[PDB]
Design a protein around this ligand. Structure first.
Ligand SMILES: O=C(/C=C(\O)C(=O)O)/C=C/c1cc(C(=O)c2ccc(F)cc2)c[nH]1
Ligand code: NA
Length: 357
C-alpha cells in the first residue's frame, strides 16, 4: 500500500508519469502565483505520489488505491489519458499573468511581490524592465540581470564538482578539519540544478570560528576576484529552542552567492568569455546538528514537508533542520547520521537518490 507520505515512499529520478506530473506541477505553480495555498498543496501531493510509481498510468483503473488523488486531480489524469495533454495546464502556459510571473521570477532577486508590481505596471519582457529609466533595482536584482544568461543555464555535475573543489579549498584554508557536503538536487542524483548548495561543519571549531568562516571564505574569494555577489545571513539559531511547528525556516548562518567559475576548472566532455556565473549557497551548522541540517538541505522540498508532517501527526515528534524533539518523552533526540533520524521516527531509511518526491 502506497503511503500518503513522501518519507514512506522511494522516489527515484526515473519518472514514468512525467506527462501527468509536468501538468500537475504547472497547475500547482499557478496556484502558488494566485496565492491559492490549498489547491497548490493538493496538486503538489498528487504530483509527488505519481513521481513514486514504478510504472506509467495508462488507464483510470491504474489510479485505484493511490492516495492524494482527489476528484479534481483524477479529471486532469483522465484528460491526459484521452488526448496526450492537459487542457488545464495548456491554458496556464498561455496565461499572461503566469507567463509574466515565470519570466520575472527567473531573475535572481525577483520574487512574487516585485513580479506582481512589474506586471501591474504593464511590463511583459525582461528587455523592457532592464532598459526602463524610472525603475529602481535592488543589488540582488542588478546581479540577477547582469549574470542572467549564466544563471538561467542549468548548472551541470562537472560544474557543481568544480564549485565543490573551490568551496573545499577555501574552507580548509581557515578550518582544516571542516566537513563540506554538497546537498540539494545533486546529492539526490540530479544531472542539473539552478544552484549548488553546501553544508559546512567543523568538529573542533569554536562558536566564534564557526561564525567567522563564511566571512573569511567570501573575503578570500573577493580578493581572488571570484565573488560576483554575496549576502551573508547571520545565524538566528537557538541551541535549546523547540523545533518549528510551521514549511520550517532554517536559522543557521548561510550565504547566497554568485561565483565566477573559470572554464579551466571544469573537467567535462566539452568557447565564450571563458567563465560562468554560478549560484552557490553555503550553510554553516554546529557539529552536533550536522545530521538534521544534512537531512533538511538534501530535500526534496516535498520530502521535507512530508517528513515534518509525519513526525508531527504520526509520532508526536517535532522535526526541523536543527533538531528532533519527542513531545511524549519530553526529550530532544540525538543523531550522528540521517539513518539515526529515520530510525528515531520509525521510518525505513530512504537513500538520498530516493528522496526526489
Ligand atoms: O530541489 C528541491 C525541491 C523540489 O525539487 C521538490 O519537492 O519537488 C529542494 C532542494 C533543497 C532544499 C533547499 C533549499 O533551497 C532550502 C532548504 C531548507 C531551507 F530552510 C531553506 C532553503 C536546498 N536543497
Ligand atoms: Na527569482
Amino acid at each position: 500500500k502506497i503511503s500518503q507520505y513522501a518519507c514512506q515512499r522511494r522516489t527515484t529520478l526515473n519518472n514514468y508519469n512525467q506527462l501527468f506530473t509536468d501538468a500537475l506541477d504547472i497547475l500547482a505553480e499557478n496556484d502558488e502565483l494566485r496565492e491559492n495555498e490549498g489547491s497548490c498543496l493538493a496538486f503538489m501531493r498528487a504530483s509527488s505520489v505519481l513521481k513514486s510509481l514504478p510504472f506509467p498510468i495508462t488507464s483510470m483503473k491504474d489510479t485505484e488505491g493511490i492516495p492524494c488523488l482527489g476528484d479534481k486531480v483524477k479529471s486532469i489524469i483522465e484528460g491526459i489519458i484521452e488526448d496526450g495533454e492537459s487542457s488545464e495546464a495548456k491554458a496556464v502556459l498561455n496565461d499572461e499573468r503566469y507567463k509574466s510571473f515565470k519570466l520575472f521570477t527567473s531573475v535572481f532577486g525577483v520574487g512574487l511581490k516585485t513580479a506582481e508590481k512589474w506586471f501591474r505596471m504593464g511590463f511583459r519582457t525582461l528587455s523592457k524592465i532592464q532598459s526602463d529609466k524610472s525603475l529602481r533595482f535592488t543589488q540582488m536584482q542588478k546581479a540577477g540581470f547582469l549574470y542572467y544568461e549564466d544563471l538561467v543555464s542549468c548548472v551541470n555535475r562537472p560544474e557543481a564538482e568544480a564549485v565543490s573543489m573551490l568551496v573545499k579549498e577555501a574552507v580548509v584554508t581557515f578550518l582544516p578539519d571542516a566537513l563540506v557536503t554538497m546537498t540539494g538536487g545533486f546529492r539526490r542524483g540530479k544531472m542539473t540544478g539552478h544552484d549548488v548548495d553546501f553544508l559546512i561543519t567543523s568538529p573542533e571549531a569554536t562558536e566564534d570560528e564557526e561564525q567567522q568562516l563564511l566571512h573569511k571564505v567570501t573575503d578570500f574569494w573577493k580578493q581572488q576576484g571570484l565573488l560576483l555577489y554575496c549576502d551573508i545571513l547571520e545565524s538566528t539559531f537557538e541551541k535549546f529552542k523547540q523545533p518549528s511547528r510551521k514549511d520550517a525556516a532554517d536559522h543557521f548562518q548561510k550565504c547566497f552567492l554568485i561565483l565566477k567559475l573559470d572554464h579551466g576548472r571544469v573537467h567535462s566532455e566539452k568557447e565564450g568569455k571563458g567563465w560562468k556565473a554560478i549560484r552557490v549557497d553555503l550553510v554553516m551548522c554546529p557539529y552536533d546538528r550536522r545530521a538534521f541540517a544534512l537531512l533538511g538541505w538534501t530535500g526534496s522540498r516535498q520530502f521535507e514537508r512530508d517528513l515534518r508532517r509525519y513526525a508531527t501527526h504520526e509520532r508526536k515528534m517535532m522535526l526541523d533542520n536543527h533538531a528532533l524533539y519527542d513531545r511524549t518523552k519530553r526529550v530532544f533526540l540525538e543523531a550522528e547520521s540521517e539513518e539515526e533520524i529515520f530510525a528515531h521516527l520509525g521510518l525505513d531509511y530512504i537513500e538520498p537518490w530516493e528522496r526526489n518526491a
